[PDB]
Amino acid sequence: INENVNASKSRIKDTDFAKETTALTKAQILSQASSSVLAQAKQAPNSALALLG
Amino acid sequence: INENVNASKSRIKDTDFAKETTALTKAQILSQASSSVLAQAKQAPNSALALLG
């Protein structure tokens, strides 16, 4: 019973490194990508002023 | 009667060394097999960590 309890006390509490790491990598790429979009968004006001000296 | 009751007081109490030895041997391979499986199941967590840097 105790062994099956320990098996039961996993995938409910104990994480799996397979899907956890991939979700982490997707999250890291998401943060890196979105932060790069910030850089391309800072220049929009610059063009919004360049037309008038 | 004493000779006969001594025969009756054997295979009731006295063990035959033939089948007892084989049962002892079978247990020895059983323990050795499980201990080797122990060392083999030790790295099951290790493989999970191997997929992350």
From Swiss-Prot, chains A, B:
Heteromer of multiple flagellin subunits including FlaA, FlaB, FlaC, FlaD and FlaE. Disulfide bonds: none annotated. Belongs to the bacterial flagellin family. It is found in: Secreted; Bacterial flagellum. V.cholerae is able to differentially regulate the flagellins within the flagellum maybe to produce flagella which are particularly suited for motility within a given environment. This is Flagellin C. It comes from Vibrio cholerae serotype O1 (strain ATCC 39315 / El Tor Inaba N16961). It comes from the Bacteria. Flagellin is the subunit protein which polymerizes to form the filaments of bacterial flagella. FlaC is not essential for flagellar synthesis and motility.
